Amino acid sequence: FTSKDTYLSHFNPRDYLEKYYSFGSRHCAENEILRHLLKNLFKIFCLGAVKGELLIDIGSGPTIYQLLSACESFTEIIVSDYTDQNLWELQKWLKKEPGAFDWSPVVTYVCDLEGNRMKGPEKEEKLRRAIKQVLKCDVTQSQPLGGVSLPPADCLLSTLCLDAACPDLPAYRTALRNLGSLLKPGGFLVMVDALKSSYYMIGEQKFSSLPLGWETVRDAVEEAGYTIEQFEVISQNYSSTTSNNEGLFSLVGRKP
Ligand SMILES: Nc1ncnc2c1ncn2[C@@H]1O[C@H](CSCC[C@H](N)C(=O)O)[C@@H](O)[C@H]1O
Numbered sequence: 549f550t551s552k553d554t555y556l557s558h559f560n561p562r563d564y565l566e567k568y569y570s571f572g573s574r575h576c577a578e579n580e581i582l583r584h585l586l587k588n589l590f591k592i593f594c595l596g597a598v599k600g601e602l603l604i605d606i607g608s609g610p611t612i613y614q615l616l617s618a619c620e621s622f623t624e625i626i627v628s629d630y631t632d633q634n635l636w637e638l639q640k641w642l643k644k645e646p647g648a649f650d651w652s653p654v655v656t657y658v659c660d661l662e663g664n665r666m667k668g669p670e671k672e673e674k675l676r677r678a679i680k681q682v683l684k685c686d687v688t689q690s691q692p693l694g695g696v697s698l699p700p701a702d703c704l705l706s707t708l709c710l711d712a713a714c715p716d717l718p719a720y721r722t723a724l725r726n727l728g729s730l731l732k733p734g735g736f737l738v739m740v741d742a743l744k745s746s747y748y749m750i751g752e753q754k755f756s757s758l759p760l761g762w763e764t765v766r767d768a769v770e771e772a773g774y775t776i777e778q779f780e781v782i783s784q785n786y787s788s789t790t791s792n793n794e795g796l797f798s799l800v801g802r803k804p
């Protein structure tokens with residue numbers, strides 16, 4: 549199983565973004581998954597009771613797509629990742645640097661989803677404004693943010709991270725417990741991840757995944773104490789040879 553060290557030495561943020569999040573003419577399977585992810589996140593953050601002051605995103609990588617609807621419902625956002633170069637790629641975009649990844653097509657799509665009450669540049673400004681901190685994190689640690697003093701979060705978000713970070717089910721359960729240390733009683737856990745995937749690719753670079761069915765995900769989350777408020781299966785697959793996933797899931801849990 550892919551180690552933490554392999555992420556540091558092999559994960560190329562710009563390549564990752566180009567292959568999965570360009571929302572262009574190529575990578576059509578990847579485009580379809582992204583549309584569905586954005587639809588589910590819109591419903592989770594804009595149509596429900598998932599709102600509050602502070603949201604902490606765990607394992608953000610170099611991406612912001614998972615935060616676009618969230619910033620309508622949360623005033624403060626903290627993003628975090630294990631991999632230093634991912635955080636720097638994120639910063640390129642936050643600081644509006646030349647050469648930052650083009651998120652426009654994604655931003656436009658979310659604006660469309662939210663009824664066009666807002667144009668692209670306004671949405672991008674609002675997200676930049678909401679993101680308060682960009683921090684190192686390690687989900688495998690009892691104190692995932694290195695024990696920095698932060699208020700307990702109203703929402704804990706993690707997309708496409710836990711399957712990649714956990715070599716087996718005991719490790720997956722431990723990571724779930726670890727994340728809970730950051731969340732208020734009554735707070736929301738929002739999770740997205742691949743189903744039944746044992747790997748994903750960034751070009752030639754292969755990264756491990758823990759293959760889990762939706763029932764197994766449900767049980768692990770429920771055994772961690774969460775009341776599952778929402779759970780959806782996304783029945784789309786990544787491109788052949790890109791992953792062996794059979795769909796993805798999204799879920800909303802509430803901490804007792
Ligand atoms: N032990 C760990 N703790 C926190 N993050 C980890 C981790 N091991 C791997 N990761 C991160 O998990 C991410 C998987 S790529 C997922 C990126 C983004 N959240 C998206 O939805 O596309 C990588 O950015 C990697 O750095």
Ligand SMILES: COC1=CC=C(C(N)=O)CN1C
Nearest residue numbers: 568708711742745747748757
């Ligand atoms: C697009 O990024 C990803 C795709 C599939 C993954 C998996 N666990 O199969 C993980 N992952 C980060």
